[PDB]
């Protein structure tokens, strides 16, 4: 067995298939970051750091010796525990199709939110700079009126053009901004369609982020490194409940500072 | 023979083909529910209940015995009788093509209305909860002005997005609402086209329901179980008329509470 | 894995084989009901109800609609927990052949007693009518003197003959009555042999029932429906003991009211 200790969990095979399906579905729906960044293959469990290729000056060991430390970025392992009713698990073999997988959905939504907020806003404790912090283009303010959203977005499209950047540009919106441009309409279309006319990429719902992000998806600018992708593991169990977790280990690198514009309220 | 007792009816083969065609045509046109829900294969005449896979605590038979009843949902058989003129039946072999099949059309419309109102509004006596009652998303009020319909519908599309749900969304409208958004026009299109721009599913005419329903058609959320599909059976006859019926047996299950938004006036 | 969670139990393979053998042996010995009734194949875990083929009038959904609920009988799941010493389990691999399987035997005897008392005396909470309650033939009183038992039994054989019934008749006795007709002797034979001369079926020891039952085993009159047959499942464990259970899910149907005579004290 492995670190998931999956065979020790009192979960049947059919219940496991339903839990895997629910977690994978809810996660994909709430991920916006993997649609725009380069996603590496999983390095594996032993992978601990990503080389940046830079060098750090250290106090010379002896006379005439020049020493340099190799720089690297550590992976962070992110774990979201959740708790399942054993009655709901037992219902699945009897043929129930409405078993309560709400904790699985909440854990997948929380893991997806962490991953997206780590990619776009950073996680300083894990030495990850967000796309918002690593952007060299000027930051823009989103207006209160949703009918004035496409104007400011177009100004962001000016900045990537002034930065000398090609590629399909894509706009990612926070859930508040996505709702505002979805529910306001002008001439038989919502403002989301007006945003769709400005770019050759995609208007992407990004419920974890704040503000908005416009960026190129030409490739090679944004890199998500995975040691291991999302997995479900077993912690402990009692007569009534099974404690499990969702787990993934990653770091994020931004190679190109001028490939994005961040917007705030 | 079977329970339809079809060979006992004084109906010719050509008249039978015309009656089957008229009933099938009028039924499909008035069904909205089967276009969005999962429809099972017919179980057969012996099928009486659908297992839910849940358990019900019952008073222990003896000491040290733990007993549980298996929960299930009963099928309901729905029968709509109708009456045909025997002169109209006799006209068909002579080559008439305008035989009065209005009772067949009224029976098919009434059966379709029952089935759709059972799926969407429930039938408590048959222990069927409607989609409106089983929805966990908040209910919305449809405005008086049809030009304000697409706005509220978009708010419903917000709620399924806040519920974490994917899939093609589809909007079903009552006949009053469908007429209102069909006959009011803005900038060379009716409001029905404005609704069509908001979703990747279909604006569906649903004359049996009240209000409106927005829901995902990704699959596995809404399940119509059929023991036997719509069939035409023979009851009795006299010199002038033949009494027949339309008959179908079914139950409806909603597995996913957050996959729909109901709207009312 | 399944709902038994059998691989999670700290029970060795040899100990499992001994427990299965002990439970199966003790159960068969104490079952009288399966020797006389028709026993279906196991439906499976998803099976929840048995269709009776009857219809129940419900309040018409709308005008001109005739609705009927399909009638059915729910299965009941019967679980008898029991507790095993882990020292006795560990003794089996070392080669012990006297490991204490008394709790297994008591659980099998209790499960067999429940099943037989459910078949013959009913379980109202599970909507099961017993053979005694569903019999239309008159009930008889068993006399105090065992030498007068064969007389009354013969009167029961009159009643099935007056009911117009063929087939091998079989007599099932309670443990008190079986002991009384076993230990009293007349002319070199016990009274049990005198009972054996009256029928072409079998004198059957039925320790769970009260009184006596005489009935035909021609087939098609008494039907035991099994979703799942007797299985051993794992609940929980500590350093000293393993909690397991015996479990079976069933219902019982009596199709023929006049195929049996019940006797009481």
Residue numbers in the entry:
A (entry chain G), B (entry chain FB), C (entry chain A): 1 to 265
What does the paper say about this structure?
The overall structure of Enc subunits across species with different T numbers is conserved and consists of a peripheral domain (P-domain), an axial domain (A-domain), and an extension loop (E-loop).
We used 89,072 particles which were found to be in the fully assembled state, yielding a 2.3 Å structure of the complete M. tuberculosis encapsulin shell. The icosahedral assembly of 60 copies of Enctb can be described to consist of 12 pentamers, 20 trimers, or 30 dimers. The dimers are formed by the interaction of E-loops from Enctb subunits of two neighbouring faces, forming a tight interaction. We did not find a clear pore at the points of twofold symmetry. The diameter of the central fivefold pore is relatively large compared to the reported pore size of other species, such as 6.8 Å in M. smegmatis, and 8 Å in M. hassiacum. Overall, the encapsulin shell structure of M. tuberculosis is similar to T = 1 from other species, with some species-specific variations, such as the relatively large fivefold pore diameter and the rotation of the distal section of the E-loop.
